[PDB]
């Protein structure tokens, strides 16, 4: 449900995700790196599947962050795909892909994969 | 077809893979990298699922290569998961995971993912 998703979330590496879920399935916000001052904020956009999910099923969602802002340009973008699971302890469990822009020759090793779990802290 | 997996396969990057499929699910061979070279050969071991597949399905398999031989040690290993499809043009379509040994702080980016299609051409 949009409300449950909306809020501030953190993951085990110390990064910050601030998101607002709109009624039209949109996801917007900012993502901040693990500690490190104020200018570590990047724009994120995503989508969530507003489910009739009376199954205790999670809500599927995903979002993208291109690692470029006014202070830095890492020439890479990450996409997180996962599910939002509500309750008193809501969590968003994801798997992510981080692709860096490479030349033809290193394209083979341009993508990293991992997983992150986010815990909600504020609305 | 069943032991049609046995043979020499090549992928788009130039690497060669030579394997023997045992009648009970084993996959053994050598994987050689860039240039062909001489000891760009690494041991590979894997498993494949021997099944009836009336519905024209491919054969699931996977294998690993630790990137260490008596000449190099890249502190990493790759696992390929995919399926074999035989026919006039047999192919092995895979997705792979390459994990490097890192320290905690770099563990978040220890794994690369990709895909490779191997042919006998």
């Amino acid at each position: 449900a949009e409300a449950g998703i909306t809020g501030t979330w953190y993951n085990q590496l110390g990064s910050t995700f601030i998101v607002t879920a709109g009624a039209d399935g949109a996801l917007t916000g900012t993502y901040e790196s693990a500690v490190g001052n104020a200018e570590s904020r990047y724009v994120l956009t995503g989508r969530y599947d507003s489910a009739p999910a009376t199954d205790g099923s999670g809500t599927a969602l995903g979002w993208t962050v291109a690692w470029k802002n006014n202070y830095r340009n890492a020439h890479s973008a990450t996409t997180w795909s996962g599910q939002y699971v509500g309750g008193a302890e809501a969590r968003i469990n994801t798997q992510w892909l981080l692709t860096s822009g490479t030349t033809e020759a290193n394209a083979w090793k341009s993508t990293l994969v991992g997983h992150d779990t986010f815990t909600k802290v504020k609305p | 077809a069943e032991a049609g997996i046995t043979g020499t396969w090549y992928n788009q990057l130039g690497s060669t893979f030579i394997v023997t499929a045992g009648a009970d699910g084993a996959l053994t061979g050598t994987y050689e990298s860039a240039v062909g070279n001489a000891e760009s050969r690494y041991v590979l071991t894997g498993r494949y699922d021997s099944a009836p597949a009336t519905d024209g399905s491919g054969t699931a398999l996977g294998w690993t290569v630790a990137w260490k031989n008596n000449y190099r040690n890249a502190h990493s290993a790759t696992t390929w998961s995919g399926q074999y499809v035989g026919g006039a043009e047999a192919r092995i379509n895979t997705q792979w995971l390459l994990t490097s040994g890192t320290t905690e702080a770099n563990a978040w980016k220890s794994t690369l993912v990709g895909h490779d299609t191997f042919t006998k051409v």
């Binding site: 020759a105 083979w108 | 990057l13 130039g14 860039a34």
Partner: peptide
């Protein structure tokens, strides 16, 4: 890395 192409 021995998994990539050659370094030619």
């Amino acid at each position: 890395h021995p998994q990539g192409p050659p370094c030619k």
